Design a binder for these strands. Structure first.
Ligand SMILES: [Mn+2]
Ligand SMILES: [Mn+2]
Ligand SMILES: [Mn+2]
Ligand SMILES: [Mn+2]
Ligand SMILES: [Mn+2]
Ligand SMILES: [Mn+2]
Ligand SMILES: [Mn+2]
Ligand SMILES: [Mn+2]
Ligand SMILES: [Mn+2]
Ligand SMILES: [Mn+2]
Ligand SMILES: [Mn+2]
Ligand SMILES: [Mn+2]
Ligand SMILES: [Mn+2]
Ligand SMILES: [Mn+2]
Lengths: 106, 99, 87, 97, 99, 82, 94, 105
DNA sequence: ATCAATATCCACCTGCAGATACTACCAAAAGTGTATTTGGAAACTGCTCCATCAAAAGGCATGTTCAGCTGGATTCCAGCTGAACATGCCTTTTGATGGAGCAGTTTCCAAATACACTTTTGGTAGTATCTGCAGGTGGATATTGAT
DNA sequence: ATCAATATCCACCTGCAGATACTACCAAAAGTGTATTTGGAAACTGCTCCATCAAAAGGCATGTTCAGCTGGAATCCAGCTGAACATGCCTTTTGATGGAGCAGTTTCCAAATACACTTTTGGTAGTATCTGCAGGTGGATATTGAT
């Protein structure tokens, strides 16, 4: 019986595929065994972080299904995800509700 | 006696409406013609995947919305509520799109 | 044998109400009359630059069809990375 | 003729979703976004690790290159936790076989 | 009466003087002092190549000069000739360095 | 006299920088605003530089560490290697 | 002691060809080195992505050309392509 | 033996460009034409800047190109400035430029 | 218009930091020649999906009228920031001087690659069937604006 | 404050697009095992260049005064621009057809990698000669600002 390198690492994300993509990508001559494991963990962790916040945005909007709008809400409302993805456009994500105070009536 | 909302009330209602939704605001077929006309001037006899045109429209609208945001800040900086061509130009200069 | 009609002046297909709506999403409350032509000019430059790069990718791959990936790659190198249409 | 296989992270994204929000689904377009995200962050990290190894005349990308790449790329807390999750996964991996 | 130039006359003179030259405009040692202090918060007992410090001062000064240009445009946009924090903040916001 | 290091970046030096930036008239609050902006810049750049230093297992920040850091921040610098 | 490569002597050669009686300071030579290295990286990097996008394992002159068109402004690109094609043509015949 | 640079009619080192390409992890393989083409493009770009910087040296009554002259050459050239738009030249300074509204009277 | 006070420019000069021309030394690197491998261009063609078609209709663009209130011009003046001058404080120079540590060299093994074989899996593919929620209606609540 | 016109809300529901489910199939992917190669860590160490030291020298930062002039506040008003309405066009939607061309599979050789060997070159290190021009001087004169 064989164990996937993912299960060996305790990960959901595919360690094997990530290893292949690293070799196939011309990043370096050699790729250590620890590299795809570490990378797969980071990618999985970030995926979890975004899906957590997006799931909340969906709940906040009385929805059970995450759509691009929820992903955008989760990203732009989180300071660090917003910084990481500051040069990224989420298709069909729209923008945050934000009206400059001076534009309000009084 | 016919009801009129004051100047600016409907504008604010429209801001809240469109900041709440995610649909494209430029009509589909006119944008497609613009893309084809522009591409044609660069290279004749091109074809387009439908998702290619949609990808362009998503990018163009997100670019213009973001630019209008910066433009708005430039107008407010000048103690105005009305965006003007020189606001757009200032925003693009500082962005490094004309510098 | 037959070709489609000539394509010209399609930038005017970017109507004044379409530009107003975009400004609204951008949080704009009041719009000067000269904004609409300024915006069309700005959009055409943006579109030209992206399409030029996309078509360059297309030609390099010896294709006659511009793909979504051609555009995505074009957007990426112009620093306008786009999620949701491919790789 | 069979159309060639198009690989994605969908089933893995989905697993993590259920770990995180068991009663929440995700649309195909949103899954499309997530796929773009994972691929993007992959290339960024891999790219930074590549330069890193080249600057130091190393021909091997190890977990140490990945870690420094993650610290350079991610802001504050995201980096802290990513590094921790990454280290934990490697120590567990090597402690087997 | 003893001689006295009008306000702004000498300022314009300084602009012409410093836009003509390339020499660094921050004192070397106070800058070197600042660099080491900041670096100490990331890693203790660091040493610096002399070229490393100089590379930092060149990059930092070129950055501030460029920022001051954009800041100047923002002040002028608001029909002022005096730059204010208001102007720096707007320039950095539009630049994408914040908000 | 007791003196903070960021205050070592003096008003006349900031003035000269503004002059090269074509600035004619300067408000009183500019000098503290500038020092804060300066500090964030150095922090971001030096942090990345030191991270390259640590990875190479060195105790000396090189010009190349700085140059690599600046390239990451989109502030590419010519003249110091690379 | 080990050796450190630069483009200095090639930059100097090109200088004497365009301005036979003009010198260049060491600082200015450093800038030129940074320039050549930068453009090399940009073009090589772009050609790399091109080859990858098209499932290619070989970077040829064709990838270098498309990369040049993508990276250089109009006229600089036109002349660069022309210079590039010229050099590969003469190298083929010589 | 005749060097590939000579064979290509170039001052820039073709052999070195090739080695740098291979060891740079840009691709698995490198066609023989690629380092020739790339070396030529680099030589041409180098010639273009040195021409303009040389002129700038003349204009300032100097015979030796210094960083300042390189900065003047690049920023006064629409295309070179765009190409090097996110690049700072050490000890280059800036172009003389005063906003009209700041001039007296 | 005049006229005094500085700043600014041009011509010339000289010391020297930095450029240069030289000879010799050499490890690496580039060229050459031969054997071997293989990427990807050709050719052929299955089949996705792109361009084009029609036809019906209502969502939305266009154009106009009307006047609310915004932008721009004008005035005015308190006070902020520039100019100038008098101090004196600490940046700068540079030169010597330990010695930290970068970096070159040697050793050698944990870990990487190559490879052959076995097994597991994720990706269509074809149908088949839930299900979240878009969008419709209707009626109650809230907002805006006139008075 | 009252009230009326209209937007906004939210419960309720229904059709269905798209999500979920299942089986079947399998080519590529992933894992195992054995043998072979080697990147780079470790230890030692020489030499570069970094930190620090004294110690004037003075250039430049700091504190103060004074007032020119700018920023900001207030006032006015022409006319730009938003809101609303009538009209009807062209985008949207739905569906179908032909075929352009993208893409999948197979054959095949020009070109690339892989070695082994020879020859060339660029970086180097002292070593000595040379020179472009920074910086200083004087005196012409241009600019600025007072009358
Ligand atoms: Mn045309
Ligand atoms: Mn093959
Ligand atoms: Mn009126
Ligand atoms: Mn007003
Ligand atoms: Mn030691
Ligand atoms: Mn399965
Ligand atoms: Mn609804
Ligand atoms: Mn070895
Ligand atoms: Mn007064
Ligand atoms: Mn004023
Ligand atoms: Mn009509
Ligand atoms: Mn065909
Ligand atoms: Mn030689
Ligand atoms: Mn001089």
């Amino acid at each position: 019986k064989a164990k996937t390198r993912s299960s060996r690492a305790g990960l959901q994300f595919p360690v094997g595929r990530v290893h292949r993509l690293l070799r196939k990508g011309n990043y370096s001559e050699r790729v250590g065994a620890g590299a795809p494991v570490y990378l797969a963990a980071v990618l999985e962790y970030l995926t979890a972080e975004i899906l957590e916040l997006a799931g909340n945005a969906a709940r906040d909007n009385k929805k059970t299904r995450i759509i691009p709008r929820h992903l955008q809400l989760a990203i732009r409302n989180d300071e660090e995800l917003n910084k990481l993805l500051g040069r990224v456009t989420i298709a069909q994500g729209g923008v945050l509700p934000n009206i400059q105070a001076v534009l309000l009536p009084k | 006696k016919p009801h009129r909302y004051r100047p600016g009330t409907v504008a604010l209602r429209e801001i809240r409406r469109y900041q709440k939704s995610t649909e494209l605001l430029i009509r589909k077929l006119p944008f497609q013609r613009l893309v084809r006309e522009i591409a044609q001037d660069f290279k004749t006899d091109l074809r387009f995947q439908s998702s290619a045109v949609m990808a362009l429209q998503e990018a163009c609208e997100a670019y213009l919305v973001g630019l209008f945001e910066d433009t708005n800040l430039c107008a407010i900086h000048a103690k105005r509520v009305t965006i003007m061509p020189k606001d757009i130009q200032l925003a693009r200069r500082i962005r490094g799109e004309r510098a | 044998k037959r070709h489609r009609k000539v394509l010209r002046d399609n930038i005017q297909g970017i109507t004044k109400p379409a530009i107003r709506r975009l400004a609204r999403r951008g949080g704009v409350k009041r719009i000067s009359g000269l904004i609409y032509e300024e915006t069309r000019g700005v959009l055409k430059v943006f579109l030209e630059n992206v399409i030029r790069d996309a078509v360059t990718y297309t030609e390099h791959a010896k294709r006659k069809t511009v793909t979504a990936m051609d555009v995505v790659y074009a957007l990426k190198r112009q620093g306008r990375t786009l999620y949701g249409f491919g790789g | 003729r069979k159309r060639s296989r198009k690989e994605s992270y969908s089933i893995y994204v989905y697993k993590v979703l259920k770990q995180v929000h068991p009663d929440t689904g995700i649309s195909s377009k949103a899954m499309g976004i997530m796929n773009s995200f994972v691929n993007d962050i992959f290339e960024r990290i891999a790219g930074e690790a590549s330069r890193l190894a080249h600057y130091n005349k190393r021909s091997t990308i190890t977990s140490r290159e990945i870690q420094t790449a993650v610290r350079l790329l991610l802001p504050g807390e995201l980096a802290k936790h990513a590094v921790s999750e990454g280290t934990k996964a490697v120590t567990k991996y090597t402690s087997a076989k």
